[PDB]
Amino acid sequence: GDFEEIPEEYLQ
Amino acid sequence: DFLAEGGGVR
Amino acid sequence: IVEGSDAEIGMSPWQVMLFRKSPQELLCGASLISDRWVLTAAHCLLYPPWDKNFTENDLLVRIGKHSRTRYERNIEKISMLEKIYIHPRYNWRENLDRDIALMKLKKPVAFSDYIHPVCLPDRETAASLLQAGYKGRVTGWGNLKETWTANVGKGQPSVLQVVNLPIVERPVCKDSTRIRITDNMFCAGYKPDEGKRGDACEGDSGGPFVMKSPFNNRWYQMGIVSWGEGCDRDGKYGFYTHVFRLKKWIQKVIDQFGE
Amino acid sequence: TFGSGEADCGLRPLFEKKSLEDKTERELLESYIDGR
């Protein structure tokens, strides 16, 4: 589970 | 019983 | 995917990733059938034996991806779900029958060199292409091996994997398992005497099993990576959700010629 | 279902669309005659 960035806009 | 028969979802 | 190889860039533009928000975890694959509809295996979303019950706002859909983990800022597209649909007669308990789900995208996606939808079979294509013997192609970012030595390496791939594998006859599928095979499944893989390997494995689910028609030169999604006993075992085949028998349902819920 | 029509799915922009094959594809096409 080695994942990068993604715009926090999508993680809220 | 899937689990019993040793089955496994992917 | 076990015993597969890295996909080339753009080779399966309809491959979609099912990404869980928190914690950020790749949960399954999926396929683009349209600019707003994505088809997956239902047990990605709904598996009570492992307390697995997702709601439209838990997950995200990442479309256009090559790398498993990287944020492919310019290529991929990241989407929110409006509604999730699971097939009303999906049997997770007993035999995993009608392992299918649609998910509708809150907003439609723009098609590119890396994003484009697969076809859904019609009767003649199902008729002529689902034959024992004929190879399909499976792709996905799931586990490379059944089990591995912990912390000595990486058990899930860096990039999308491809494996081509042939469709086994019903009787042979049927006597490979003691689980209740239904006419909404197929199994696929190589025989032990075949001297070639490959399978899909956990996290590859929902990923499309496709065929290419030699006559119109197009790709059709014939199945959905569903279940199996372990991964890449001899005399053991992978089972897929036979999309063509489930297409009238997919009709009912896309309801294309409507509102 | 007697269903084709409208909207070009299946024809992959970097590949079919450009008359290029991918590396393992012909294995699939051949399995229809059974070879290689």
| Residue D23 maps to a domain | yes
Spell out the domain ranges in chain C: 1-12+118-244, 13-117+245-259
Active site residue C67: no
| Residue D4 maps to a domain | no
- Residue in C with minimal Cα distance to D31: C134
What is the distance between the alpha carbons of residues D9 and C106, in angstroms, rounded to a whole number?
21
| Residue D28 maps to a domain | yes
> Residues C202, C137, C190, CA angle at the centre, nearest 5°?
75
Size of interface B-C (CB pairs under 8 A): 47
Active site residue C205: yes
What kind of architecture, by CATH, is found in domain C13-117+245-259?
Answer: Beta Barrel (2.40)
| Residue D34 maps to a domain | yes
According to the entry, how was the structure determined? Answer: X-ray
Residues in A touching C23 (Cβ below 8 Å): 1
Residues in D touching C220 (Cβ below 8 Å): 10
Count CA within 13 A, CB hemisphere, residue D14: 15
What is the distance between the alpha carbons of residues C64 and C193, in angstroms, rounded to a whole number?
37
User: What's this structure's resolution in Å?
Assistant: 2.5
Asked whether the bond before C88 is cis by omega within 30 degrees of 0, the reply is no
Give the bridge partners for C210, in sequence order.
C137, C221
| Residue D2 maps to a domain | no
| Residue D21 maps to a domain | yes
User: Which of C46, C204, C229 is most worth mutating to test chain B (most B CB atoms within 10 A of its CB)?
Assistant: C229
| Residue D3 maps to a domain | no
Which domain does D24 fall in, by range? 11-36
- Residue in D with minimal Cα distance to C213: D29
| Strand, coil or helix: C215 | coil
**Dihedral sign of CA atoms D11, D14, D19, D25 in order:** negative
> Contact A3/C69, CB-based, under 8 Å?
yes
> Contact C227/B1, CB-based, under 8 Å?
no
Q: Which of B5, D14, B2 is nearest to C12 (CA)?
A: D14
Question: What tokens appear for C114 in the block?
Answer: 């890396």
C1-12+118-244: CATH topology is Thrombin, subunit H (2.40.10)
Domain count, chain D: 1
Q: Which residue has the tokens 């598996």?
A: C47
What is the distance between the alpha carbons of residues C142 and C144, in angstroms, rounded to a whole number?
7
How many Å lie between the alpha carbon of C123 and the closest alpha carbon of chain D? 5
Domain C1-12+118-244 and domain C13-117+245-259 have a common topology: yes
